Design a binder for these strands. Structure first.
Lengths: 85, 85
DNA sequence: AGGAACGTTCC
DNA sequence: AGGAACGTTCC
């Protein structure tokens, strides 16, 4: 499995990252309460020289898309995948 | 050792390539009698999707330079390295 | 210098 | 699907 798939899997499951990135109670989406915190505290642990933009691009390559359910907190990010039951 | 270093080493030493690329009798330079033939018959054996330009660029990365000893056959190429005894 | 890790592509 | 090869970077 691709390094990115491995990394995302480990990052969202690893208990030490729970306040920055974790599964929704249904497992349907990955929740990132605060992008800045996530970028500062988790990304550097899995990637060498990367940013949220690069992260989001990689996520797309694997079918993950940003959920747009806000009716006009830009800090909160949530991703769901194109493929589901 | 880098894949390119390995490849060049094997390509210039492998008896099957002798009419296309080989060492000078002194070992000081690599002689390529005819670039077209070399490109058509040897390069495809060691590289996936590459051309003489890309080859020459890689050669430079490792200190090999084209010998310019002609007084005004553009087909003949010869390389010597920056580092010598 | 050389072998362990980590990665991607080949088979 | 999964392991063999091949590569580069890490240690």
């Amino acid at each position: 499995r691709p390094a990115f798939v491995n990394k995302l899997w480990s990052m969202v499951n690893d208990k030490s990252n729970e306040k920055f990135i974790h599964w929704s109670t249904s497992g349907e989406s990955i929740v990132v309460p605060n992008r800045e915190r996530f970028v500062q505290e988790v990304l550097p642990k899995y990637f060498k020289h990367s940013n949220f933009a690069s992260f989001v691009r990689q996520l797309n390559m694997y079918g993950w898309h940003k959920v747009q359910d806000v009716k006009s907190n830009d800090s909160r990010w949530e991703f769901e995948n194109e493929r589901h039951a």
